[PDB]
């Protein structure tokens, strides 16, 4: 008979196919809270991150829509709609704060103390950077500073390991550079250090591809397109 861990992993993949990512999250958390000294397999670790990226991702999209609407109704001085919109937004933000705190507790409690290779250390620290950065995207004032500070500590810990342990062409490292640069551009409003970081990750990858090739080419070339996309539209905005 299969173990609970096997059946939770199987349910999670059923949850992903039915597109019920909340329950996908719950199943993958049962797997994580059942760990001893060992760490998640690449597969389970990617199932956890896909679950959470899709739960948070639906709220982020909702937040963005409700924010743009509120910015329009502010533009007309239509306060009653504005107050309704903001109660709605505040509710979406309460979910964002809960989803983030779920994964962020897991990461510090189970996942990061189990990481045993460079691959997973970077993977979990970058995911800690990511979810502190989703908080930053909507927090204001004192709360925003704390998020941004947490984000920067996590991404820099990730990158100290990534640049010393993974190849320039590794998708988790390229993904880290991609997000770290986005954090400089959109949270810290620093286009100078966004481009320096993004373009340096791209150039070290190109250099490795030109001399050594790489394995898992599929994933990296697309993140590399992402890097180049953000770069060419960041640098058109500095000029334009």
């Amino acid at each position: 008979a299969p173990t609970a861990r096997e059946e939770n992993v199987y349910m999670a993949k059923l949850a992903e196919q039915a597109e019920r990512y909340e329950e996908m999250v719950e199943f993958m958390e049962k797997v994580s809270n059942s760990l001893g000294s060992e760490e998640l397999t690449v597969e389970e670790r990617n199932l956890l991150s896909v679950a959470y990226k899709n739960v948070i991702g639906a709220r982020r999209a909702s937040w963005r829509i409700i924010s743009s609407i509120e910015q329009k109704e502010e533009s007309r001085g239509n306060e009653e709609h504005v107050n309704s919109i903001r109660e709605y937004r505040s509710k979406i933000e309460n979910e964002l704060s809960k989803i983030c705190d779920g994964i962020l507790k897991l990461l510090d409690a189970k996942l990061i103390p189990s990481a045993a290779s460079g691959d997973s250390k970077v993977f979990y620290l970058k995911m800690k950077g990511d979810y502190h950065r989703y908080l930053a995207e909507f927090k204001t004032g004192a709360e925003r500073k704390e998020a941004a500070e947490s984000t920067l500590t996590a991404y820099k810990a990730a990158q100290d390991i990534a640049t010393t342990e993974l190849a320039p062409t590794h998708p988790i490292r390229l993904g880290l550079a991609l997000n770290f640069s986005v954090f400089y551009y959109e949270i810290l409003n620093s286009p100078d250090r966004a481009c320096n970081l993004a373009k340096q990750a791209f150039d070290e990858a190109i250099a490795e591809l030109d001399t050594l090739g790489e394995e898992s080419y599929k994933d990296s070339t697309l993140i590399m397109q992402l890097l180049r996309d953000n770069l060419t539209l960041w640098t058109s905005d500095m000029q334009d």
């Binding site: 963005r64 991609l178 993140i223 953000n230």
Partner: peptide, 5 residues
Amino acid sequence: YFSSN
């Protein structure tokens, strides 16, 4: 809103 991994 920019591209992120």
